[PDB]
RNA sequence: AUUGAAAGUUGUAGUAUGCGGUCCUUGCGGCUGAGAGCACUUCAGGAGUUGCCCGCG
């Protein structure tokens, strides 16, 4: 078994992650699996190597960006692109990282830089952080790309969200 | 004096204004508590009895 971890960031965020696991996982395959919730870690065991879970990743990800080009520096009324992206600067910068991404994928190559986490994946987040006596500049919070596009597939194809 | 320390989810706001439970209406007309009827029939205030007794204008 697998049983790949998953990063401790927010029980919210960690919850889009290792619940968008899974659908990165059903598209390639990845029979008798199963996720067991810790409170915020929710570890899930399957039977699958990692060629599998990129594939099947990758295969979300080219439906998310075909669903992208589909309306439109793009601009998509999309649920990662505009419909959830509270912020306008947003519309643009997730369809780029995720073409990004994409593009390291097919290529058999590992990310090897991070990227801010929006609000819409984790309320929990934000801009500042209190250290000591004030904040930052910029924002503090930072996630691996890679975990950062499989949170967004599995908010994009389980939450449902109104607007 | 605890990643806690400072902090109003705050101030102002009428469901309010005019709107008939209203106009017409017999508890109405006819009706014998009436006809027959002995307080009637028998009946003694009744039976006894010295104004009594004496008398010179």
């Known amino acids: 078994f697998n049983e790949f971890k998953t990063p401790q960031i927010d029980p919210i965020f960690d919850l889009y992650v290792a619940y968008g696991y899974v659908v990165s996982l059903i598209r390639g395959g990845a029979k008798e699996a199963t996720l067991i919730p810790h409170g915020a ?68 190559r590992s990310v090897k830089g991070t990227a801010t986490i929006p609000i819409t994946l984790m309320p929990s987040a934000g801009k500042y952080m209190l250290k000591h006596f004030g904040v930052q500049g910029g924002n503090p919070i930072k996630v691996d790309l890679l975990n950062y596009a499989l949170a967004w597939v599995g908010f994009h194809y389980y939450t449902p969200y109104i607007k």
């Open 41 to 108: 870690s929710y570890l899930i065991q399957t039977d699958v190597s990692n060629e599998e879970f990129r594939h099947g990743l990758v295969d979300a990800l080219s439906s998310m960006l075909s669903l992208h080009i589909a309306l439109a520096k793009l601009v998509s009324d999309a649920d990662f692109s505009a419909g959830a992206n509270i912020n306008n600067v947003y519309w643009d910068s997730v369809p780029r990282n995720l073409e990004k991404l994409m593009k390291d994928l097919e290529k058999k």
